[PDB]
Amino acid sequence: ERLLDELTLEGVARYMQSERCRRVICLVGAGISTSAGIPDFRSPSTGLYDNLEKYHLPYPEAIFEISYFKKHPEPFFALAKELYPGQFKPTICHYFMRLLKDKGLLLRCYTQNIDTLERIAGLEQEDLVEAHGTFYTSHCVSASCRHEYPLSWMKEKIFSEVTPKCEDCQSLVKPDIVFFGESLPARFFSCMQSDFLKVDLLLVMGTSLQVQPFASLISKAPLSTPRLLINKEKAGGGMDFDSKKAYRDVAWLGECDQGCLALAELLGWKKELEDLVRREHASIDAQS
Ligand SMILES: CCC(C)(C)c1ccc(OC[C@H](O)CN2C[C@@H]3C[C@H](C2)c2cccc(=O)n2C3)c(C(C)(C)CC)c1
Numbered sequence: 578e579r580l581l582d583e584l585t586l587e588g589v590a591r592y593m594q595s596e597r598c599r600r601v602i603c604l605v606g607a608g609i610s611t612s613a614g615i616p617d618f619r620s621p622s623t624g625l626y627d628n629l630e631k632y633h634l635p636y637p638e639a640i641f642e643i644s645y646f647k648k649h650p651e652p653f654f655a656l657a658k659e660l661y662p663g664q665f666k667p668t669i670c671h672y673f674m675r676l677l678k679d680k681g682l683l684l685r686c687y688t689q690n691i692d693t694l695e696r697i698a699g700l701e702q703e704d705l706v707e708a709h710g711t712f713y714t715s716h717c718v719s720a721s722c723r724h725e726y727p728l729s730w731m732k733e734k735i736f737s738e739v740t741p742k743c744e745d746c747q748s749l750v751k752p753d754i755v756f757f758g759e760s761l762p763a764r765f766f767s768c769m770q771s772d773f774l775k776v777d778l779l780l781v782m783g784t785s786l787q788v789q790p791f792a793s794l795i796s797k798a799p800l801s802t803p804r805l806l807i808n809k810e811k812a813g814g815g816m817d818f819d820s821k822k823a824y825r826d827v828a829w830l831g832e833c834d835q836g837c838l839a840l841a842e843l844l845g846w847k848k849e850l851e852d853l854v855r856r857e858h859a860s861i862d863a864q865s
């Protein structure tokens with residue numbers, strides 16, 4: 578089935594404004610947070626895994642490996658102190674997703690990011706699937722305790738260079754991120770099944786799809802679901818933008834903010850979006 582009239586941003590805009598497009602899923606990666614001064618720590622190109630020499634790890638990946646972390650948590654928290662941002666300011670792209678929520682178009686945002694910016698932008702727990710977890714909350718690692726700690730507590734521990742320990746049972750306190758050797762959250766697998774039935778549009782932003790878990794996700798949405806990619810680079814996932822058989826996939830190449838602004842324009846949301854970014858940034862400035 579053919580749902581987009583044309584395989585262009587204009588066509589996607591037009592589809593979004595039609596009665597057909599009720600439920601949008603966003604899939605978002607590190608590219609939506611780069612313009613917030615969170616660089617893409619994941620992808621190898623960034624070279625994060627070269628600044629780790631001073632932590633004398635057995636191998637660079639050890640800094641994110643759960644068993645290593647439990648024995649030697651100090652490098653992870655030192656790194657966190659090193660790279661902790663001055664402010665947490667969500668990007669235009671984040672606020673575009675806020676618009677989708679408030680217009681009742683957002684079914685779900687699946688995010689690879691742990692930076693909490695979606696939450697700060699006003700996306701709620703129901704709206705979000707944090708595929709790699711989050712720094713927003715932390716928990717004592719003991720299964721009989723699991724004392725919860727807010728980011729404010731974790732930040733203080735990070736800045737004081739005191740290893741987070743549970744006030745109750747003395748166990749290590751770990752940010753709710755998915756370390757190497759830990760499994761994806763159950764939430765991820767459960768929401769996927771149900772969501773990928775009801776979805777009318779996939780908005781894929783700041784991820785190359787060459788990389789799990791979005792590579793798989795994309796390939797098992799219904800065949801007729803239109804998919805728009807907004808990314809600096811070209812897309813895995815089994816997308817088809819270019820062939821004579823292309824029917825549903827659209828690529829916008831450039832920065833995520835600029836792509837979102839362009840899409841907002843066509844929807845007639847540009848002013849609303851620019852105003853929201855300005856207002857929410859000012860609010861953050863006032864309370865920071
Ligand atoms: C404190 C500043 C803050 C919250 C703003 C921030 C933000 C991002 C941060 O890191 C982003 C990483 O890309 C998150 N990844 C989470 C885990 C382990 C690593 C790293 C990884 C690599 C490749 C695939 C993959 O799935 N995963 C999952 C980090 C740190 C602390 C973890 C220091 C690097 C902190």
Ligand SMILES: [Zn+2]
Nearest residue numbers: 717722743746
């Ligand atoms: Zn505890």
